[PDB]
């Protein structure tokens, strides 16, 4: 009764039924009063929120971790900055989970490199968390849903989802670690032989990447790039015909590979053009490179992949830049026109790459 | 191979053999420094088609192929072709469980896409960390192989659990945000203990002034630098609340000093050109504090205002202008109408101004 606040009307009646449901599962009046509103009081347990708080000093003492590094991790993960180590502010679970990060430093990694990776993860996970919010809201916030409908629906859904997230995360991480190490193996294997690898094949490789701003100079947001990536893939798939291979969509970019450069430069140019004419998209840029590369599990690795990716990064919006390797590999009668973009030093590569801007 | 770059190989090959690597493996894949590592990251040399995965796991084939495409795996039109690694096929099969729980497939795919992207940037930053640990002065290939083996054996298993911990922290935050939001709706007004604050977010863009893309390693570094600058510049009564990836959050009882701090922060980032430009969004109103952080309407408005702010710009809600009170002692701010009139997830029309010194 005192657990209904200043509420009246539909809202007050909805709250009373929520409190009843909470009280009868064993949540105490004090807990309900301490949590305004108590809508997710039952649901938040499932993600580790027990309504308890901890000081940085207590975490340091109990878990035997460095206090200064703990605070550096706590802040890098996105927790509130607390300058007083004795102040009981942070949620207990947040403090305990930050403590687990010292292990990476005990096993010999620099505290600075650990912190950097945590920052990157935090950025990425903030985008993933937002998509997860929408997904969950669509399922729970049905029309007319009352506070009790929401409390119960969200509790039921979250209880089933939580056991699935751990395994999913590791699986997606591992997928990326495999790709990253396969890229690395092929790198060193190309540089030891100097020349081709076994299985290798002459390919022309292009990445076509959406730029992160509109023509007016606005920022194309992260959730909008998610939706546009799927639209870029549909489009690349429609314009892509043999002998052009549409390999994969990564981020807001598509990867195309071809034995021969002519039909590919052609497909990339067409692709940049229909994006330019569709006002839903920000502009597209593309980088192209030719050479010897090997394929594992349907993907392509090697120098032309490395070069194409870096050349895509330095291309201006609406522009198709190509390494000299691509124009040399063009043989006969073509109708592209070429401007010399100049020699350019690219980040992961050494031998200054000569670039050409390409147009119909 | 003959001499001193050969006794080098001797060391490696003998070790590789003792790591359970077979003679055939040692050449079916040339210079073999990382063979002993594949099994620890889920690669056992097995490969399965989309259809065989569909019936191994009893899942829908079309949805499976869609999730596989969304995560950034090679596109395979033929469902009977054996192309993907098994582990890659199986990870995609987990997606149907979320759908069977009542989640929209379109949105599951979308979650999967955004998470794959976030984790690819994480892996790139991990590549440099690993290369810094392993590649030490005078490193022979055996050194590099043993180094990789220890790293992947001891460190990699801690990564999944660490990323789940990071995600749960943010899911805890989210649930507080959604509770406070529902609380405001039900009451039709701010909640008990609510305080009058001005909130600002300052966000780095994904590109520098010339349109180039910031790498993942560079992103982590710059985010740390922004955190440092915000720390240097934020003094009482302004509070530096947190850094979430590449954005900082400032909160203050009074709008004038917060606004002065935000402007200064954007200015300074605009003098070093290694930084992408900074942009900021500001709102004023009532908010509740939990765990050092702030929750409520002005936090949600300022966040969405930052999202529509242009590079180099501080965009403020009308709420801030009213909070300054058209009798402000401290007001050497220039005001121009700007920005959109609508914001995603925020009820009515909204009035925005660009502020400069
Ligand atoms: Ca309890
Ligand atoms: Ca982009
Ligand atoms: Ca940003
Ligand atoms: Ca951000």
DSSP A178: H
**Secondary-structure class of domain A181-360 per CATH:** alpha beta
Length of chain B: 357
The rounded distance, in Å, linking the Cα atoms of A4 and A11 is 9
Q: Enumerate the residues of chain A whose CB falls inside 8 A of the CB of residue B91.
A: 168, 171-172, 174-175
Does residue A34 belong to the interface with chain B, where contact is any CB pair within 8 Å?
A: no
Contact in structure between B184 and A191 (CB atoms under 8 Å): no
Residue with token string 């709102």: B283
Name the 3-class secondary structure at A288: strand
Strand B195-204 and strand B247-252: the pairing is antiparallel
Name the 3-class secondary structure at A255: strand
Residues with CB under 5 A from ligand 2 (ion): A 209, 212, 252
The rounded distance, in Å, linking the Cα atoms of B204 and B219 is 9
Query: Which residues lie below 8 Å from residue B255, measured CB to CB, with a gap of 6+?
Result: B198, B282, B284, B320, B323, B324
Q: Return the C-alpha torsion angle A303, A309, A313, A316, nearest 10.
A: 100
Is B310 annotated in a binding site? The answer is no
The rounded distance, in Å, linking the Cα atoms of B117 and B111 is 10
Query: Which residues lie below 8 Å from residue A67, measured CB to CB, with a gap of 6+?
Result: A56, A57, A60, A85
Q: What share of chain A is helix, strand, coil (3-state, %, to 5)?
A: 50, 20, 30
Distance between A322 CA and the closest CA of chain B, angstroms: 17
- Cα nearest neighbour of A173 on chain B: B119
For residues B293-323, one letter each, b for 16 or more C-beta atoms within 10 angstroms of the residue's C-beta and e for the rest, the string is: bbbbbbbbbbbbbbbbbbbbbbbbbebbbeb
Structure token pair of residue A97: 């989970």
Residues of chain B with CATH 3.30.70.1230: 175-357
Structure token pair of residue A88: 């009981």
Does residue B146 belong to the interface with chain A, where contact is any CB pair within 8 Å?
A: no
Alpha carbon of B162 to ligand 1 centroid (Å)? 25
User: Of chain A residues 304-323, which have a CB less than 8 A from chain B?
Assistant: 313-314, 316-317
Name the 3-class secondary structure at A15: helix
Q: Return the C-alpha torsion angle B71, B73, B77, B82, nearest 10.
A: -130
Half-sphere exposure of residue A282, counting CA atoms within 13 Å on the CB side?
27
Q: Residue A55 class from Cβ within 10 Å (0-12 exposed, 13-18 middle, 19+ buried)?
A: middle
DSSP A197: P
* Experimental technique used to determine this entry: X-ray
DSSP A55: -
Contact in structure between A121 and B166 (CB atoms under 8 Å): yes
Contact in structure between A183 and A301 (CB atoms under 8 Å): yes
Alpha carbon of A211 to ligand 2 centroid (Å)? 4
Distance between A333 CA and the closest CA of chain B, angstroms: 32
Across the interface, do A166 and B166 touch by the CB < 8 Å criterion?
no
Which H helix or E strand runs over A327? Answer: helix A324-328
The rounded distance, in Å, linking the Cα atoms of A323 and A217 is 28
Which H helix or E strand runs over A124? Answer: helix A111-140
**Does the CA dihedral B268-B271-B276-B278 come out positive or negative?**
positive
Contact in structure between A203 and B87 (CB atoms under 8 Å): no
- Cα nearest neighbour of B306 on chain A: A219
Dihedrals phi, psi of B234, to nearest 5 degrees: -90, 115
Q: Please state the three-class secondary structure of chain B as a single string.
A: CCCHHHHHHHHHHHHHHHCCCCCCCCCCCCCCCCHHHHHHHCCCCCECCHHHHHHHCCCCHHHHHHHHHHCCCCCCCCCCCCCCEHHHHHHHHCHHHHHHCCCCHHHHHHHHHHHHHHHHHHHHHHHHHHHHHHCCCCCCHHHHHHHHHHHHHHCHHHHHHHHHHHHHHHHHHHHHHHHHHHHHHHHCCCCCCCEEEEEEEEEECCECCCCCECCHHHHHHHHHHHHHHHHHHCCCCCEEEEEECCEEEEEECCHHHHHHHHHHHHHHHCCCCCCCCEEEEEEEEEEEEECCEEECHHHHHHHHHHHHCCCCCEEEEHHHHHHHCCCCCCCCCEEEEECCCCCCCCCCCCCEEEEEC
Length of chain A: 360
Q: Resolution, rounded to a tenth of an Å? A: 2.3
Binding site residue list of A for Mn(2+): 209, 252
At the second CATH level, the architecture of B175-357 is: 2-Layer Sandwich (3.30)
DSSP A198: T
Distance of CA B21 to the CA centre of its chain: 37
Q: Enumerate the residues of chain B whose CB falls inside 8 A of the CB of residue A345.
A: none
Least distant ligand from the CA of A219: 3
Dihedrals phi, psi of A287, to nearest 5 degrees: -125, 135
**Nearest CA among A110, A177, A107, A287 for reference residue B124:** A177
Alpha-helix residue ranges (DSSP H) falling in A202-279: 222-239, 261-276
Alpha carbon of A51 to ligand 1 centroid (Å)? 7
The rounded distance, in Å, linking the Cα atoms of B174 and B103 is 18
Query: Which residues lie below 8 Å from residue A210, measured CB to CB, with a gap of 6+?
Result: A220, A225, A228, A229, A232, A252, A253, A275, A281, A282, A283, A284
Q: Which regions of chain A does DSSP assign to beta strands (E)?
A: 53-54, 90-91, 201-210, 245-250, 253-258, 284-296, 299-302, 320-323, 337-344, 353-359
Does residue B135 belong to the interface with chain A, where contact is any CB pair within 8 Å?
A: no
Which H helix or E strand runs over A12? Answer: helix A10-24
Which H helix or E strand runs over A70? Answer: helix A67-76
Across the interface, do B168 and A229 touch by the CB < 8 Å criterion?
no
DSSP A329: S
Across the interface, do A53 and B291 touch by the CB < 8 Å criterion?
yes
Does residue B120 belong to the interface with chain A, where contact is any CB pair within 8 Å?
A: yes
């Amino acid at each position: 009764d005192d657990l209904l606040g200043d509420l009246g009307g539909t809202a007050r009646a909805e709250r009373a039924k929520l409190v009843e449901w909470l009280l009868e599962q064993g949540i105490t009046p004090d807990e309900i009063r301490a949590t305004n509103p108590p809508l997710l009081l039952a649901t938040r347990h499932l993600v580790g929120d027990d309504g308890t708080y901890v000081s940085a000093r207590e975490i340091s003492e109990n878990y035997g971790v460095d206090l200064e590094l703990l605070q550096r991790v706590q802040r890098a993960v996105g927790l509130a900055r607390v300058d007083d180590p004795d102040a009981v502010v942070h949620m207990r679970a947040d403090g305990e989970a930050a403590a687990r990060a010292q292990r990476f430093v005990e096993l010999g990694l620099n505290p600075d490199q650990v912190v950097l990776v945590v920052r990157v993860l935090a950025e990425g996970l903030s985008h993933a968390a937002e998509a997860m919010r929408y997904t969950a809201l669509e399922a729970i916030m049905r029309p007319g849903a009352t506070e009790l409908d929401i409390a119960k629906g969200s509790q039921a859904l979250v209880s089933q989802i939580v056991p699935l997230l751990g395994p999913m995360i590791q699986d997606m991480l591992f997928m990326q670690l495999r790709h990253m190490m396969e890229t690395e193996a092929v790198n060193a294997g190309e540089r030891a032989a100097g020349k081709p690898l076994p299985g290798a094949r002459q390919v022309t490789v292009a990445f076509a990447d959406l730029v992160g701003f509109t023509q007016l100079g606005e920022v194309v947001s992260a959730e909008e790039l998610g939706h546009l990536a799927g639209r870029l893939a549909g489009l690349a798939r429609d314009l892509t015909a043999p002998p052009v291979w549409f390999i994969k969509t990564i981020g807001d970019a598509v990867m195309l590979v071809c034995p021969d450069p002519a039909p590919l430069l052609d497909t990339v140019l067409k692709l940049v053009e229909v994006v330019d004419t569709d006002n839903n998209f920000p502009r597209l840029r593309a980088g192209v490179a030719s050479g010897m590369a090997v394929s594992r599990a349907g993907d392509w690795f090697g120098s032309p992949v490395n070069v194409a990716s870096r050349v895509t990064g330095v291309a201006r919006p609406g522009a198709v830049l190509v390494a000299d390797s691509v124009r040399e590999a063009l043989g006969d009668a073509d109708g592209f026109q070429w401007s010399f973009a100049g020699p350019r030093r690219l980040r992961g590569i050494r031998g200054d790459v000569r670039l050409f801007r390409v147009r119909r």
